[PDB]
């Protein structure tokens, strides 16, 4: 009689076809090998299910009213302290958190809808930690603070820094310790187009575009330093970012 309902996060819940004397619906789900069960006052598969792991950890699956979001939580055996939390949001991005013995977040993995990831590890009580962005073809490494994520690529005397602010806004900067005006790279960030323009000797050399698709493209300027030439090329590997900083 039960109705199978498809959930975000590659899960399924079975909901009773009819409500009980309280007006409520029974919910059953199998997550990995774990059986979870619950009761809901909605008929569509939303609500709360609970179970226990073989090691007595408590498990809770919460499904939002519109089935847009799921939260899968694991707790200590008394149910008081979080051990892990995975939220799949309505855009199908996910956040996976682990918690120290006190239940403070110690690790957070964000998986975007396109599969690229922000990996935050060794998170401390001030929200600082290590950071890695996992892109298609390459990874960017850096640090996390409560103000921003800073991912760094070095090439020669040039340091490229991609910042992701606490609000999610991106800015990019370039620093070059080359003190010679003939060769030193400088760069300007255009927040409107998410483009870093690199200049050498008062002429633009290339545009690095940080796309909404979580890719980077590079396009050269003509020797005149004012017009772009050719067409932008998508970076596929870390060596190509380094080449763009030469």
Helix-strand-coil split of the chain, %, nearest 5: 5, 55, 45
Same domain for 194 and 175, yes or no, is yes
Q: What was the structure determination method? A: X-ray
The answer to whether the beta carbons of residues 86 and 96 sit under 8 Å apart is: yes
Residues 136 and 232 in one domain: yes
β 170-176/185-190 pair status = unpaired
Q: Specify whether the CB–CB gap between 103 and 111 falls below 8 A.
A: no
Question: Are both 59 and 174 inside the same structural domain?
Answer: no
Tokens of 196: 């870093």
Q: Are residues 8 and 89 in the same domain?
A: yes
- Indicate the SS3 state at residue 194: coil
Same domain, 109 and 89: no
User: For the purposes of burial, counting CB atoms within 10 Å of the CB of 34, is it exposed (0-12), middle (13-18) or buried (19 or more)?
Assistant: middle
Could you tell me the resolution of this structure in angstroms? 1.6
**What domain range includes position 94?**
1-100
Q: Judge if 222 and 244 occupy the same domain.
A: yes
E strands, 90-202, are 94-99, 105-111, 117-121, 129-135, 138-144, 148-155, 158-165, 170-176, 185-190, 195-200
Q: Which residues contact 63 (CB under 8 A, 6 or more apart)?
A: 7, 13, 45, 46, 47, 48, 49, 69, 70
Q: What is the dihedral of CA 155, 159, 160, 166, to 10 degrees?
A: 140
**What is the domain count for the chain?**
2
Spatial CA neighbour of 30 closest among 72, 69, 77? 72
Name the 3-class secondary structure at 93: coil
Distance (Å, whole) CA 40 – CA 57: 23
Q: How far apart are CA 49 and CA 35, in angstroms?
A: 9
DSSP type of residue 222: P
> Which one of 84, 100, 116 terminates a domain?
100
Please, which residues bridge with residue 234 across strands? 217
Give the N- to C-terminal CA distance of the chain in Å, as an integer. 66
Domain co-membership, 153 together with 208: yes
């Amino acid at each position: 009689n039960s109705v199978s309902v498809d959930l975000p996060g590659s899960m399924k819940v079975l909901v009773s076809k009819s409500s009980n004397a309280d007006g409520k619906y029974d919910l059953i789900a199998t997550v990995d090998a774990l059986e979870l069960s619950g009761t809901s006052d909605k008929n569509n598969g939303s609500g709360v299910l609970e179970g226990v792991k073989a090691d007595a950890s408590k498990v809770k699956l919460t499904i939002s009213d519109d089935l847009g979001q799921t939260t899968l939580e694991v707790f200590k055996s008394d149910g008081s302290t979080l051990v892990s939390k995975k939220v799949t949001s309505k855009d199908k991005s996910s956040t996976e958190e682990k918690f120290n013995e006190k239940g403070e977040v110690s690790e957070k993995i964000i998986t975007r809808a396109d599969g690229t990831r922000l990996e935050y590890t060794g998170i401390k009580s001030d929200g600082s930690g290590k950071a890695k962005e996992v892109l298609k073809g390459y990874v960017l490494e850096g640090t996390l603070t409560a103000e921003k994520t800073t991912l760094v690529v070095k090439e020669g005397t040039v340091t490229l820094s991609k910042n992701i602010s606490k609000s999610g806004a991106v800015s990019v900067e370039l620093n070059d310790t080359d003190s010679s005006a003939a060769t030193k790279k400088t760069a300007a960030w255009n927040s409107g187009t998410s483009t870093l323009t690199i200049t050498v000797n008062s002429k633009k050399t290339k545009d690095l575009v940080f796309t909404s698709s979580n890719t980077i493209t590079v396009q050269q300027y003509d020797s005149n330093g004012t017009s772009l030439e050719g067409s932008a090329v998508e970076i596929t590997k870390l060596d190509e970012i380094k080449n763009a900083l030469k």
